[PDB]
């Protein structure tokens, strides 16, 4: 479903003589808390020998966009392990919020590279501070003064099965 950003922290259980664990923190994009926790546990297991049964979640907090009404350019680290071995991938997306950017990135990955959500790992999502730092042409194109373009071939959705007007598209 629609993604959400959750702050997930782990404090792998303190054994005898080792209180106050390191309290590792993460930012996980997921549709709900359960999926966020599952992905956090999977990442923690992958990184080091910790396991879900050996630790617990400290706190889960949803990270809301600071400015969900501002248009921003995002640079995203993309690493996916299909079909061949994992390789680095960088994509630039223009969106109003980080969650929308992540959703668009996942949709584009599924559309083009057939990579599934479980097969894609998001390492970094960074907002580009200044213009001209964007490298991909399809994003820099919209960063032009007084950008104006038409929408030719407008199509009107007809609720009725029959039309007597021979609908015309305008223009």
């Amino acid at each position: 479903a629609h993604f959400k950003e959750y702050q997930v922290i782990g404090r792998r259980l303190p054994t005898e003589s080792v209180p106050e664990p390191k309290l590792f923190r993460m930012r996980i994009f997921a549709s709900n808390e359960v999926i966020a926790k599952s992905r956090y546990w999977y990442f923690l297991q992958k990184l080091h020998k910790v396991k879900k049964a050996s630790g617990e979640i400290v706190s889960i907090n949803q990270i809301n966009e600071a400015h969900p009404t501002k248009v921003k350019n995002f640079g995203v680290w993309v690493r996916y392990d299909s079909r061949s071995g994992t390789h680095n991938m960088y994509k630039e997306i223009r969106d109003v919020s980080r969650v929308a950017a992540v959703e668009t990135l996942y949709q584009d990955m599924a559309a083009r590279h057939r990579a599934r959500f479980r097969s894609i790992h998001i390492l970094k999502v960074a907002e580009i501070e200044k213009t001209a730092d964007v490298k991909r042409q399809y994003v820099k194109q919209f960063l032009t003064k007084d950008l104006k373009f038409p929408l030719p071939h407008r199509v009107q959705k007809s609720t009725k099965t029959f039309s007597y007007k021979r609908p015309s598209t305008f223009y």
Partner: peptide, 12 residues
């Protein structure tokens, strides 16, 4: 091609 690739080196 990452604009802020330098920040990774600074963090390292």
């Amino acid at each position: 091609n990452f604009p802020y690739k330098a920040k990774i080196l600074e963090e390292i």
